[PDB]
């Protein structure tokens, strides 16, 4: 029943910021802002966080995002023995994503498998759809982008 996504495919196959998918950008969330409080760190041991920032930013995400990510962590481990979900980007303050990226409000993650096997990513993406992410995009050969609706 699980059909991998192809490179560059997104599901549902509509724009990320439409109602049927993740909906509109509501504004960047900065570290000092009142809105920063609606992000909480995901400390699930089932998930590897890249944290190249050495700030813990990658762990920060909305509740809806955390719930979907934790479900996906499970299905990754079930699909591939000894492999775990890895998050390269969560909430972001570095600023390299698209203008009005959902990363800027903690509603998106970029992910790989822990073994960095590029040929697992199409199926990883399908697992993310089944885990309930509101939009999943096989954005790069190097990672999958997944996002969620606002709370």
């Amino acid at each position: 029943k699980l059909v991998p996504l192809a490179y560059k495919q997104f599901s549902p196959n509509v724009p990320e910021k439409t109602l049927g998918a993740s909906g509109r950008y509501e504004g960047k969330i900065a570290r000092s802002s009142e809105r920063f409080k609606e992000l909480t760190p995901n400390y699930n041991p089932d998930i590897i966080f890249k944290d190249e920032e050495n700030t813990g930013a990658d762990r920060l995400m909305t509740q809806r995002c955390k719930d979907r990510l934790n479900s996906l962590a499970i299905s990754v481990m079930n699909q591939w023995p000894g492999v775990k979900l890895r998050v390269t980007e969560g909430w972001d303050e570095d600023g390299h994503h698209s203008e009005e990226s959902l990363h800027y409000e903690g509603r998106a993650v970029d992910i790989t498998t822990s073994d960095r096997d590029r040929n697992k990513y199409g199926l990883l993406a399908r697992l993310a759809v089944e885990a309930g992410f509101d939009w999943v995009y096989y954005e790069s050969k190097a990672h999958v982008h997944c996002s969620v609706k606002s709370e």
Binding site: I48, E52, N54, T88, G95, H96, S140, A142
Partner: protein, 102 residues
């Protein structure tokens, strides 16, 4: 020449080819009391690595506000961050950008 404390901010990173990535940063000299700056260190590592010892380093002159990293691998994601320095020492790292060659 006090050691710099505050580092540069990388404004953007963009691939120019299958082996090269352009980065442009802002550095405001007043941010470190106009201490003289000898140059910048630009660090890059394949994004598949989470080992902070795996960054390679380019040295750039202190007047530059952009640099092209070359000799990279095609269709490969890199983590990119930077410091400024002088005889006293080095700043903290900049923000960390992620950018793929073509």
């Amino acid at each position: 020449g006090s050691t710099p404390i505050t580092g540069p901010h990388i404004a953007y990173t963009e691939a120019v080819s299958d082996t090269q990535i352009m980065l442009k940063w802002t550095y405001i000299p007043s941010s470190n009391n106009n201490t003289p700056i000898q140059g910048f260190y630009i660090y890059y590592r394949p994004t598949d690595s989470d080992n902070d010892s795996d960054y390679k380093r380019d040295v750039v002159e202190g007047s530059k506000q952009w640099h092209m990293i070359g000799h990279l691998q095609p269709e490969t994601s890199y983590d990119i961050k930077m410091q400024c320095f002088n005889e006293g020492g080095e700043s903290e790292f900049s923000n960390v950008m992620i950018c793929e060659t073509k």
